[model samples]
Target: TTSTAPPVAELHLHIEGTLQPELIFALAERNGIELPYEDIEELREKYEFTDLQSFLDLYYANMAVLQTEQDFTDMTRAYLERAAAGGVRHAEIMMDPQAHTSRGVALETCVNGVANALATSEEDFGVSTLLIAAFLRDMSEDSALEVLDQLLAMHAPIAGIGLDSAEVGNPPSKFERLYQRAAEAGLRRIAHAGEEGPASYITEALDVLHVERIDHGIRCMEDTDVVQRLVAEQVPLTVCPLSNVRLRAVDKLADHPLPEMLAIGLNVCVNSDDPAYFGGYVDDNFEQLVKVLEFSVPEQATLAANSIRSSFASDARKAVLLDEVTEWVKASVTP
Candidate 1:
């Protein structure tokens, strides 16, 4: 029998990445978009990704089906359903504003679609949601600043700012001005770093960008000072083994650095980066860790607690979720 999953906050996820093939077909049919796939099974075969770039090719392509606010709402709603079932209490969702706008999809369509779903998430699905308007690092920083301006002007429900996409040559320093404006606006900050990028990029994110959490910072282990600082500060680290291995960030789940990340005392927590493409949800990540990394139920509880601790959720919400973790451990596990 499957054990009850420990309650957690999914802090590192791309809202775009949650577009399952079934939904792709549904939306494609609605929008009259002609997808290259003949059938759903053909679309499923493309999930076999070789690396980051390969995955992105399909990731961007699949997004063309989303043409309306309703389409975006449906997409966010689907992720919430899957998330609630996977024991997610809260989620800090990342949505690329540039990705949509550059494709001629109105910013309001994307933001309102996702935000409307979040408005009733707690009542409908037992999940709280916060939207992070993640900027494309590959694009010019001014482009991000302009979007932030428009988001605020439109009164969009954005809780934070995030840096994402194509992290190689575009270092954190590139977005220094955007982070500065975000800081002055009192917006929370987080960024993707050290997945395929060097540890130097990770340090720049902390030192220059001042992000509160890191997405897929598995490479922090490579720089002892950076890792030590992360440990001392307990910087929230969102690591996804399924996404990591599938993207070749690591060779396999068994080879993941999560065990050592926990042992080393970083505020590391599990997440499903792109669940549909990556093979599972947050619980599935934990299940694989239990199978391969030999994590105990107590350790799983710790991971759950870390996620809530690192979230942008309110104190009231965090208290409830944290207590749920304690209660869940008692109800679901043995010492």
Candidate 2:
């Protein structure tokens, strides 16, 4: 396929999912906390996933290692370092504040430390960043509301709020109160819907929760009407092939619905939901889609362009990246 490394925006990453076992130990040692695991190698063995809830249980448990400002700082910086490697020029990362604050870390420290690292990416890596405070569905709506209040009170740099973690039983409707408050406050809305949940969850996310984007929205394809709505709305699906395969959401990348989603004009973009655990960064996602999925050259370019379009990046910035991706395609065609 004719394409150089295409520029893309990672719009659906989970910051805590980027926590590797080594970082887990480092942060634990740095914060002087004792982890339940015997060692890093032993902890690495726990990467297996039985399902979304099972994975989330470990995901939540693993983050206990991150207890201070520097720990969060390191997390974002590490993610950005690899994001740069994957040709990601911008990102809208999701974070669970309640996850940390529940463990006794203050809200200001959690938000401030993450914001500090993201705020520096533009200068250091040429990658602009936005932070989306995500509510874990396993938690209570009151907890989500409190986190939203904390975000609003702290203000600035917190671009929006999102719903994540498990999605099966905890429909977007469950967080109606918190989402209502966030919308009223003018936060950019996004949520993980239809990953392992029903197509009804996608409908609820758009209609009830009122999210601007749908994360992992592949299941919408199961219902023709729902798929039609997604295509009509042009709502972007931050499709994570590796994450899906790892979580058994899809049996393999070859069977991924990305091509079908793109074929029907659903604004779909590839991303690394959790690079450290999901296997690779955005470029790996791109390359896998290119080779394993055998996407045509023009199709690959469109994927990159779609990612930029779906991103929260300013129009002018997206235009610039589109031109860059176009140039990449042209260069690849030449040689």
Candidate 3:
């Protein structure tokens, strides 16, 4: 009863969010930064996040250990390897420049370091990579515009732009002007919506920001009209099941609306939002669906193909991966 699924693309991953406690301590020691935690065990135990803000608090604090370009390079490589092991052939990683630069880490240092590792990812980790410069929504729109200009001035190796961080007060409309500017620069666009914010934010992201993708958009179920629009337009929602439960966006995995999402005809894809902070990786997210929702192998294949189809990879890349998926399905032998 072994049905091998095809390789999937990770469309929504935060590069900094991949920083594990062990690496945090390693980087802290390497850079001579003093951590308040006594040991890695203590830090790992603190991963029990009550909500999104709680998680962001620690997520920002642990990143202090990343002071050098080598630190960024090392973190990117580690995430690539781990993702590759889980059958991810392509990854569109999101990194927050404001998060790093606000703490005195140069924008060049962050981009060059991440881009350096991504430059060799295909050869070193067997994974094709693309970087997205994500802006913190909690910050001011003016600041986002300034950072976008700086990134373009330096010609940072970024494939797109994304909006993330606290979503309650900072609606996607606040960044409309910035997103429009990035669009003029020919950058792909996406934003986090509906995980913590109301379903109205999802509508704003599409209407105002003109984003190409919506991350964590599971809450679209609340509004029937929004669901119909998403279904008709086939908008892709990068849904993170484990992150939802871990961050308490949903009560638990069993309570997640993934099956309902697919049943409603929304084009949804599975992802690991912040794998180190979440409970699992991309494959692990699929595994959770099988275990918790009794998702069959064919259902898993659909999710995998949805991920590939929704990715921002070139059409040629998509064709190759889709063919591989078909071949995998054909070769699968039922028990």
Candidate 1 vs. true structure, TM-score: 0.98
lDDT of each: 0.91, 0.86, 0.92
TM-scores of all candidate predictions against the true structure: 0.98, 0.96, 0.98
The residue pairs that clash in candidate 2, if any, are none
Score candidate 3 by lDDT.
0.92
Model 2: runs farther than 4 Å from truth? 1-4
- Candidate 3 RMSD computed on C-alpha atoms after optimal superposition onto the true structure: 1.1
lDDT of 2: 0.86
The Cα error of candidate 1 at residue 309, in Å, is 0.5
Candidate 1: the clashing residue pairs are none
lDDT of 2 by residue, 179-289 (tens): 899888988899999999988999999999899899999898889999998888898888998889889999989999999888889999888898888778888888888
lDDT, candidate 1, 123-228, per-residue tens: 9998998999999898998889999999988989999999988888889999999999898888999999998898999889998999999898999999899999
RMSD of 1: 1.2
The TM-score between candidate 2 and the true structure equals 0.96
Write down the TM-score for model 3: 0.98
